[PDB]
Structures are given as structure tokens and as C-alpha cells.
Amino acid sequence: KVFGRCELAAAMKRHGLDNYRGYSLGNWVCAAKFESNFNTQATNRNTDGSTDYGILQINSRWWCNDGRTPGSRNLCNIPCSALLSSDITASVNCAKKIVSDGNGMNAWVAWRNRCKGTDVQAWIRGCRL
Ligand SMILES: [Cl-]
């Protein structure tokens, strides 16, 4: 599924991400934009052989099992394919674990490089939340 901007904002809002660990909603929408272009089916292979999955490009190196990332962990205790659903629940639940873990939203490279230190409020402008 390719989410609309406000459609995803609203979905992230009702799943409790607005100001979760102090990260306003715009940060989560900005992250999803530049990780997946709002596409729940997005997958990308990393140079080390792990793969990033779904709307927030969650990495098989640490967070989910895809059975083809040798030596990796599955900290969210879920198959990586579950993170590709049209329903973002699994990605959000795993994201909440990731963001509570140490370096916060810096765990998302696209957030660090394209959202952090910018005005992200624009990402939820005009949305019914
Ligand atoms: Cl849109």
C-alpha cells in the first residue's frame, strides 16, 4: 500500500506515535517519507546482506527475522515479512522498541540525515488527526 501523507500521519497518530519518547508526529511521517516513500512494501538490501523492510525500513540485522541474514538478531520477535502489511501495526510496535533503545530516532538513517534539525511540522499540515 502507498499511504497518502495525511493518511499515514493519522495512522501513526492513532497508534500512539505523536510525541512518543518526545518525537512529534512530523518526525515519524518525515522518516517514513524518506525511508519508504510511504510504501508499506518497500524493501532494500544493505551492503552487509541484511535487508530493510516496510514503511519504516526496519533492518533484519537486528529487529526481525528473514532467515537469510546470518548472525543477525530478531529483537522485535517477528518475521520481517510481517512488516510489509497494509496495516502498519507491526511496524509501529517494532519502531517503538527501536526508538526506546539508545540513540532514539537516529536509528533511522533517513531521519538523521533528512529530518533531524529541520522543521518537520509541515509533514502533518492540513491533516485530520
Ligand atoms: Cl500524499
From Swiss-Prot:
Keywords: Allergen, Antimicrobial, Bacteriolytic enzyme, Disulfide bond, Glycosidase, Hydrolase, Secreted, Signal. GO terms for biological process: cell wall macromolecule catabolic process; defense response to bacterium; defense response to Gram-negative bacterium; defense response to Gram-positive bacterium; killing of cells of another organism. It comes from the Eukaryota. InterPro entries: Glyco_hydro_22, Glyco_hydro_22_CS, Glyco_hydro_22_lys, Lysozyme-like_dom_sf. The active site is at residues 35, 52. One of its GO terms (cellular component) is cytoplasm. In the egg white and polymorphonuclear leukocytes. Disulfide bonds join 6-127, 30-115, 64-80, 76-94. Its main location: secreted. Residues 1-129 form the C-type lysozyme domain. Its EC number is 3.2.1.17. The keyword Secreted applies. It is found in: Secreted. Monomer. Lysozyme C is capable of both hydrolysis and transglycosylation; it also shows a slight esterase activity. It acts rapidly on both peptide-substituted and unsubstituted peptidoglycan, and slowly on chitin oligosaccharides. Lysozymes have primarily a bacteriolytic function; those in tissues and body fluids are associated with the monocyte-macrophage system and enhance the activity of immunoagents. Has bacteriolytic activity against M.luteus. This is Lysozyme C. The lineage of its organism: Eukaryota, Metazoa, Chordata, Craniata, Vertebrata. The gene is LYZ.
